[PDB]
């Protein structure tokens, strides 16, 4: 009584609505510090005239 | 935050002569260093 397990299990089914559909989520957090930033984006190289 | 290592190798107290040191390695470590130690083989 008044004691519950803190974790509840999602009961997903393939016939549920959009409000209950399973969504896989990835959160990307980008941080910059005093160290030299190394996570660079791809640099497109133009042909040389 | 950049660790620069310059190296030079020569065939031969300190020898008397002149020899420039070319850069060897650049590292983006970004840590604080204030002390060091060598390593030996027995």
UniProtKB/Swiss-Prot annotation, chain A:
Residues 34-49 are annotated as: Disordered. Changing residue 5 to S: In strain: Lambda/C.37, Omicron/BQ.1.1, Omicron/XBB.1.5, Omicron/EG.5.1. It comes from the Viruses. Binds to host ACE2. RBD also interacts with the N-linked glycan on 'Asn-90' of ACE2. Cleavage of S generates a polybasic C-terminal sequence on S1 that binds to host Neuropilin-1 (NRP1) and Neuropilin-2 (NRP2) receptors. Interacts with host integrin alpha-5/beta-1 (ITGA5:ITGB1) and with ACE2 in complex with integrin alpha-5/beta-1 (ITGA5:ITGB1). May interact via cytoplasmic c-terminus with M protein. May interact (via N-terminus) with host bilirubin and biliverdin, thereby preventing antibody binding to the SARS-CoV-2 spike NTD via an allosteric mechanism. Attaches the virion to the cell membrane by interacting with host receptor, initiating the infection. The major receptor is host ACE2. When S2/S2' has been cleaved, binding to the receptor triggers direct fusion at the cell membrane. When S2/S2' has not been cleaved, binding to the receptor results in internalization of the virus by endocytosis using host TFRC and GRM2 and leading to fusion of the virion membrane with the host endosomal membrane. Alternatively, may use NRP1/NRP2 and integrin as entry receptors. This is Spike protein S1. The gene is S. The chain holds residues 486 to 534 of 1273 of the full protein.
């Amino acid at each position: 009584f008044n004691c519950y397990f803190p974790l509840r299990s999602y009961s997903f089914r393939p016939t549920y609505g959009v409000g209950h559909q399973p969504y896989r989520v990835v959160v990307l957090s980008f941080e910059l510090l005093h160290a030299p930033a190394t996570v660079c984006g791809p640099k497109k190289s133009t042909n040389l005239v | 935050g950049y660790f620069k290592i310059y190296s030079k190798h020569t065939p031969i107290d300190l020898p008397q002569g002149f020899s420039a040191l070319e850069p060897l390695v650049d590292l983006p470590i970004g840590i604080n260093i204030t002390r060091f130690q060598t390593l030996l083989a027995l």
